[PDB]
Amino acid sequence: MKKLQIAVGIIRNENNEIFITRRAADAHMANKLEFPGGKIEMGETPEQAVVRELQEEVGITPQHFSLFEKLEYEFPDRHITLWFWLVERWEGEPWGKEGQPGEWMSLVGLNADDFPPANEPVIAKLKRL
Numbered sequence: 001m002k003k004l005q006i007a008v009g010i011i012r013n014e015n016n017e018i019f020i021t022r023r024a025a026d027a028h029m030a031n032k033l034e035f036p037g038g039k040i041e042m043g044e045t046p047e048q049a050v051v052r053e054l055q056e057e058v059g060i061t062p063q064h065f066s067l068f069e070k071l072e073y074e075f076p077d078r079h080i081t082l083w084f085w086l087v088e089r090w091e092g093e094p095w096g097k098e099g100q101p102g103e104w105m106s107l108v109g110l111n112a113d114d115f116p117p118a119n120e121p122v123i124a125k126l127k128r129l
């Protein structure tokens with residue numbers, strides 16, 4: 001099975017809300033809630049990837065973020081490594097720049113069942129911040 005490196009951004013505002021998008025019906029992990037992000041490309045670092053992905057997907061430039069969690073997940077047909085970046089400062093206002101659903105969700109109200117299963121320990125970790 002193919003093995004991908006994925007960089008995602010946990011976009012947290014000052015009211016402890018997270019900017020969460022929903023994946024398309026024909027995507028892998030279809031219809032799931034997600035942190036915006038995507039594939040790290042050849043020639044780019046994980047730090048560069050999360051910046052580029054958040055610019056493409058939601059129209060913000062992260063600054064002074066940090067690695068919140070790195071983990072491996074074996075899906076039924078693919079293995080990925082997920083780089084979860086905590087993004088607490090950024091330029092711009094996040095929106096559905098690719099036409100995807102996107103909105104602010106209270107951290108305490110997040111339900112891990114709504115996300116890909118790889119996100120479960122990260123969501124649990126965020127809720128103890």
Ligand SMILES: Nc1nc2c([nH]c(=O)n2[C@H]2C[C@H](O)[C@@H](COP(=O)(O)OP(=O)(O)OP(=O)(O)O)O2)c(=O)[nH]1
Pocket residue numbers: 006008027028029033034035036037038039073080082116117118119
């Ligand atoms: N973006 C994102 N992906 C996640 C999360 N949790 C999780 O297991 N994934 C998985 C789903 C996918 O298998 C993979 C992300 O791939 P993607 O479809 O977002 O990649 P991409 O946008 O770069 O794809 P492409 O259209 O550029 O080719 O990581 C998450 O919180 N955010």
Ligand code: NA
Pocket residue numbers: 038039
């Ligand atoms: Na991508």
Ligand code: NA
Pocket residue numbers: 036037038039057
């Ligand atoms: Na993506």
